[PDB]
């Protein structure tokens, strides 16, 4: 079907990244014609300037230098019903690090009733020189090792306790 996933906030300088924005339909069966806009403000700016627009087949870009020859489309490939809105940014730099707004405008078709819906997805990114592992992953790995070692200690302690018991008991005969 379709699932909405929050994009990763931490990008990497010099490497590539994929900003995600999935606007799943309420009903999957409804035929629709979808297009969208992507408007970004840099860290230190207070606005939302248009940078990317996606329409039926080919996307158009504003002539900002921060994304010229630098962003490509990785949404749904040529289905006229997007339901998946991701910008693939190549050779990520500092000049795109801030807040994106993802305005998905969906013209839902029906029996005879045309609807013109708009949904905004505000995503936050922060370019970083080093791709440090997320707090959840590091805590999870550390707790995995803690659990393994604690259970090993528990079992060796139980074995030694039973060894002491059997040494005290079976030595009679």
């Amino acid at each position: 079907g379709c699932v909405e996933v929050d994009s990763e906030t931490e990008a990497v300088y010099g490497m590539t990244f994929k900003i995600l924005c999935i606007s799943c339909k309420r009903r999957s069966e409804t035929n629709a014609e979808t297009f969208t806009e992507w408007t970004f403000r840099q860290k230190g700016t207070e606005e939302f300037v248009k940078i990317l627009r996606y329409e039926n087949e080919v996307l158009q870009l504003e002539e900002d230098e921060r994304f010229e020859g630098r962003v490509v489309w990785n949404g749904s490939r040529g289905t006229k019903d997007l339901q998946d809105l991701s910008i693939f940014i190549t050779n990520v730099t500092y000049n795109h690090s801030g807040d994106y707004e993802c305005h998905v405008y969906r013209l839902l078709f029906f029996e005879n009733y045309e609807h013109n819906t708009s949904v905004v997805k505000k995503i936050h990114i922060e370019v970083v020189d080093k791709a440090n592992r997320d707090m959840a992953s590091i805590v999870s790995e550390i707790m995995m090792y803690v659990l393994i070692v604690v259970l090993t200690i528990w079992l060796v302690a139980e074995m030694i306790y039973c060894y002491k018991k059997i040494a005290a008991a079976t030595e009679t005969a």
Partner: protein, 1129 residues
């Protein structure tokens, strides 16, 4: 005198034969759809003959100017009725009431032969013993009906409604074009406001506005409609759709309600009906059985032919040739290349030749007409003659299907096979000793058939476009006799509501209600009586030192409980691998590392088991061997993703085997351990019966291959998904010349070979799936020819025959052998009560001791000052009967509740049930004053106390919710104390108390078996999540009910558990190719590809679930029947 002349005519057997034959020919005449003119005269003849018999009876038991003679015989009442209203009918202006006159002649079929009178009477005493079960059934239906009524009060009316640009709300609700008509359903889509409910599309809102989700029918917004819907739930007719509508309206969270009724209303009350009918039939059987030259050449060649080697490698060779003949019948594919059809036809010719040769050899050693005396020889002669006729003609149109009778040669294996011989014995008993009863069935069916037509036929022809889109008659009508038989047969099968809606929309409510309820009661009583009739006719310094320590570790309760907790956590780890897993990214990695932790714990406990129990004893244990296998696959997975072969097609496919991780919980739990022990102990006889069933279904499936060899291929207009007309496209040639808009689509379930044959026959025999199978088989014209609506209309009979034989007799043998096997197991070798452990056995015995308890009047008089007065004037009959009357009146007030009842009506009902709750509190307090000291010796008093407290608390909570932060979805749920207020009826209601006590008795065994079943649903749900969370949105699988998450998978598997609608869930998975699915459709937010599951694993998944659920439900049924027999006898 003169009456003596009218005595010999009465008792003369030719007169009775004349009456028999005239009734039979009249019955054949009622079959006619549109009778021509001349038939009218014959009709007169018939009634004249009927007058004849009446005259003969009226001049036989009354003499010398006597008036009434045949009025002490109840069937003579029916004869008098028909003769009277026949001549009342003769005056046509004395009217559209023919439907109440012809049917009177239709019911006359009962007395064709003496003996059906006794069978009908015996059915009457059988239904007489149904009083307690029917009253309990109606009480439970009403209780759950009020529950569903006050929960889903008009929620089933919820619909998508557009949002207007701005008379207002008067002709906006009632437009039915402002609603979301889901494509190809002709019924507005349901929604809801709460979470976990149907989602209104972007641009719509859910409003309780319009008609109920049918032509306006069995919804929940009235007590009568609720009772009808829960009768439907009790018979489980097409309850997948009620399930879907209710959960789409009120949210998935309410599904527990269904789990109650499906387990309580349908599973339990059906079992009780079956058990009490079984006890009645056993009592009937017990009573009935306790009451009582050239001749030289002929003989010299006989010398050799009778001496031609008989047993060594000839008769055994003949049997193996029969088996090879069945095999050559099996390879009948639809897509056939030459040099393969040739092989099969030359083999068939060789086999019919060898059978003719052996026949002529056996009729020259036992003489030509002395040979037709064993009986088996007669059958062999008939079948070989049929085969010879088929090979000789090879040119008959429409009757080459008689070819399939050669498969009857398979039944020669009955000479050696004992179990198939038992099957043939059951068939003979069905046609022989119990044939009368079987006849009654047919007759009754026939009656309802014609009755249905006479009551509805014309209506179905004129009221037709009321229910259709092309205004042609539906595929299930009563305009002609054959379809009226088909509808009655389908009602016998259990699929009644879908055609009952059409009836009630065509021929009014009350007529079709009465007709279809009468059919569902009488016909199912007959079918169940026949089924039980055939059923009851079945019969050293460190090594040992460390070994003891690790044994003490692995046997200790602490370690075992910790391991059990780890089993539960590891099993739950799979449930969070949703369609929604990637959106979390915190539970994802957490459970990824929990996988490593659990595998480490599992490997370590395996190592301690190794070093404690020893290798030989660890590998002589089935449970330990299974645990080792699961640890092996887990360790292989860890090696794979540590080294990095994670994204490999074989290793990733092996990753889905993680769903087997919960299976190790079988050994650790007592309930699954004992239940699986019982099942796998009884599995040998089950396997033998299954061998018989696949043999007989092989016969039917090869017959089906002959009848429908790939003739299901029909063109479809790929802009609308509909069949072509015969005029526009006729066959394969013009279908390929119809540009690209023609698909030449298959049915995805068909009879191309014995495999698809088994699948289609499983769908037919389970009755959930036969829709498109029957529709396309009846549509089947010929190979490469486009199907035509009901062209080969009589192929229904085939399925009918199958349902009689491959679903009513085979399942009968299956259940009989399981009955015998479990009888042997519980009585002779093993504990008397299987499915329960030792501690559960102690619970059961303590409960048995507790149940048969009565007070030894330990209630002295109160102390002083009129407390004894009320104490002694409350115990009497007056007070108890009065409180039951008040309970019943409160119930009747409850039934008055309805959707869109004015605020005044709600206020009136609130005042009335305030009066009732006050009168119950004063009653509770009166018994308190009677027994102020303790009052809690009997659990019924504490039940009354807890229910009155619960009613008061719910009352105050309702007030709070209605003058505080308000939410109707909580008010409706909290209002359920009144349900207990009416369950108070059980205290004095005898009979109901015993049956509910049987429920309480069987609760432990049912809990164990249902815990095993729940584990099975867990494993299958996780496997589906791995596989079918990505399938296309076809009929059965949609947004609300699918395999995406764990909740959706579990609700789908609960729908399947009662075999309901598994055809719809298998339909999307069976998609394999680009024309139906698409192997590369990137899902938004998923790295997976493809939207169709693997067909092979799809059939394996669903058929395996059907078989496992059938075995588990059979175990539940046997436990309930055992409890009923133990309590009763």
């Amino acid at each position: 005198p003169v009456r003596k002349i009218a005595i010999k005519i009465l008792v003369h057997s030719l007169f009775s034969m004349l009456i028999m034959c005239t009734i039979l020919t009249n019955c054949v005449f009622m079959t006619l759809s549109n009778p021509p003119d001349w038939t009218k005269n014959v009709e007169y003849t018939f009634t004249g003959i009927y007058t004849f018999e009446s005259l003969i009876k009226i001049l036989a038991r009354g003499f010398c100017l006597e008036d009434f003679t045949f009025l002490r015989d109840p069937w003579n009442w029916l004869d008098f009725s028909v003769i009277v209203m026949a001549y009342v009918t003769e005056f046509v202006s004395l009217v559209s009431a023919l439907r109440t006159f012809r049917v009177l002649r239709a019911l006359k079929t009962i007395s064709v032969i003496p003996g059906l009178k006794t069978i009908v009477g015996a059915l009457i005493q059988s239904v007489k013993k149904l009083s307690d079960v029917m009253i309990l059934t109606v009480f439970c239906l009403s209780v759950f009906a009020l529950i569903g009524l006050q929960l889903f009060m008009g929620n089933l009316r919820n619909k998508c409604l557009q949002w207007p640009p701005s008379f207002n709300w008067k002709d906006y609700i009632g437009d039915d074009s402002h609603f979301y008509v889901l494509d190809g359903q002709k019924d507005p889509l349901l929604c809801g406001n709460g979470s976990d409910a149907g989602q209104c599309p972007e641009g719509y809102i859910c409003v309780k506005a319009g008609r109920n989700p049918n032509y306006g029918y069995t919804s929940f917004d009235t007590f009568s409609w609720a009772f009808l819907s829960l009768f439907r739930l009790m018979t489980q007719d097409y309850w997948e759709n009620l399930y879907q509508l209710t959960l789409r309206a009120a949210g998935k969270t309410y599904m527990i309600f269904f789990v109650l009724v499906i387990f309580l209303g349908s599973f339990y009350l059906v079992n009780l009906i079956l058990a009490v009918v079984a006890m009645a039939y056993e009592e009937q059987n017990q009573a009935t059985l306790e009451e009582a030259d050239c001749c030289d050449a002929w003989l010299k060649v006989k010398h050799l032919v009778n001496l031609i080697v008989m047993d060594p490698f000839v008769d055994l060779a003949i049997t193996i040739c029969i088996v090879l003949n069945t095999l050559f019948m099996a390879m009948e594919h639809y897509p056939m290349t030459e040099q393969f059809s040739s092989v099969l036809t030359v083999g068939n010719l060789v086999f019919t030749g060898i059978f003719t040769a052996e026949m002529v050899l056996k009729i020259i050693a036992m003489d030509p007409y002395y040979y037709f005396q064993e009986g088996w020889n007669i059958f062999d002669g008939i079948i070989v003659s049929l085969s010879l006729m088929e090979l000789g003609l090879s040119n008959v149109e429409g009757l080459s299907v008689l070819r399939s009778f050669r498969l009857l040669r398979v039944f020669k294996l009955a000479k050696s096979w004992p179990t198939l011989n038992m099957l043939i014995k059951i068939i003979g008993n069905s046609v022989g000793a119990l044939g009368n009863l079987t006849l009654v069935l047919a007759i009754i069916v026939f009656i309802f058939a014609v009755v249905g037509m006479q009551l509805f036929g014309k209506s179905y022809k004129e009221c037709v476009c009321k229910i259709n889109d092309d205004c042609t008659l539906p595929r299930w009508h009563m305009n002609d006799f054959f379809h009226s038989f088909l509808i009655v047969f389908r009602v016998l099968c259990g699929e009644w509501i879908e055609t009952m809606w059409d009836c009630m929309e065509v021929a009014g409510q009350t007529m079709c209600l009465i007709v279809f309820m009468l059919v569902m009661v009488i016909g199912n009583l007959v079918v169940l009586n026949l089924f039980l009739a055939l059923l009851l006719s079945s019969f050293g310094k460190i090594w040992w030192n460390l070994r003891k320590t690790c044994y003490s570790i692995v046997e200790h309760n602490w370690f075992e409980t910790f391991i059990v907790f780890m089993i539960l956590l590891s099993s739950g780890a799979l449930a969070f691998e949703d369609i929604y897993i990637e959106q979390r990214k915190t539970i994802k990695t957490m459970l990824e590392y929990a996988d490593k932790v659990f595998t480490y714990i599992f490997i370590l406990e395996m190592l301690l088991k190794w070093v404690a129990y020893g290798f030989q004893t660890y590998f002589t244990n089935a449970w330990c061997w299974l645990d080792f296998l699961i640890v092996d696959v887990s360790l292989v997975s860890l090696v794979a993703n540590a080294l990095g072969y994670s994204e490999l097609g074989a290793i990733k496919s092996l990753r889905t085997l993680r769903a087997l991780r919960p299976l190790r919980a079988l050994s650790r739990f007592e309930g699954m351990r004992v239940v699986v022990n019982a099942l796998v102990g009884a599995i040998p006889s089950i396997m033998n019966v299954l061998l018989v069933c696949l043999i007989f279904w092989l016969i039917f499936s090869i017959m089906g291959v002959n009848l429908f060899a790939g003739k299901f291929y029909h063109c479809v207009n790929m802009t609308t998904g509909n069949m072509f007309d015969i005029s526009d496209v006729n066959n394969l040639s013009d279908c390929q010349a119809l540009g690209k808009q023609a698909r030449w689509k298959n049915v995805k379930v068909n009879f191309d070979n014995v495999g698809a044959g088994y699948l289609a026959l499983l769908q037919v025999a389970t009755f959930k799936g036969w829709m498109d199978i029957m529709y396309a088989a009846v549509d089947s014209r010929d190979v490469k020819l486009q199907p035509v609506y009901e062209e080969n209309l009589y192929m229904y009979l085939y399925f009918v025959i199958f349902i009689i034989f491959g679903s009513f007799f085979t399942l009968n043998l299956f259940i009989g052998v399981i009955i015998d096997n479990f009888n042997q197991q519980k009585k002779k070798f093993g504990g008397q009560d299987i499915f329960m452990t030792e501690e559960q056995k102690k619970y059961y015995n303590a409960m048995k001791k507790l149940g048969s308890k009565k007070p030894q009047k330990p209630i002295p008089r109160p102390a002083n000052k009129f407390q004894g007065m009320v104490f002694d004037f409350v115990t009497r009959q007056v007070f108890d009967i009065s409180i039951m009357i008040l309970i019943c009146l409160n119930m009747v007030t409850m039934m008055v509740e309805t959707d869109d009842q004015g605020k005044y009506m709600t206020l009136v009902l609130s005042r009335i049930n305030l009066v009732f709750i006050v009168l119950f509190t004063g009653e509770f307090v009166l018994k308190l004053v009677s027994l102020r000291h303790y009052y809690f010796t009997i659990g019924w008093n504490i039940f009354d106390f807890v229910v009155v407290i619960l009613s008061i608390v719910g009352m105050f909570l309702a007030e709070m919710i209605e003058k505080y932060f308000v939410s109707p979805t909580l008010f409706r749920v909290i209002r359920l104390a009144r349900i207990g207020r009416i369950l108070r009826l059980i205290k004095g209601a005898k009979g109901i108390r015993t049956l509910l006590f049987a429920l309480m008795m069987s609760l432990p065994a049912l809990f164990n078996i249902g815990l095993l079943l729940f584990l099975v649903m867990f494993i299958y749900a996780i496997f589906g999540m791995s596989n079918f969370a990505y399938v296309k949105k076809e009929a059965g699988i949609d947004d609300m009910f699918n395999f995406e998450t764990f909740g959706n998978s579990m609700i789908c598997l609960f729908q399947i558990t009662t075999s309901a609608g598994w055809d719809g869930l298998l339909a999307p998975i069976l998609n394999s190719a680009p024309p139906d699915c698409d192997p590369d459709t990137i899902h938004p937010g998923s790295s997976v590809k493809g939207d169709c599951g693997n067909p092979s694993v799809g059939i394996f998944f669903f058929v395996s679930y059907i078989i496992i659920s059938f075995l588990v439900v059979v175990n539940m049924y046997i436990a309930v029947i055992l409890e009923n027999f133990s309590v009763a006898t």
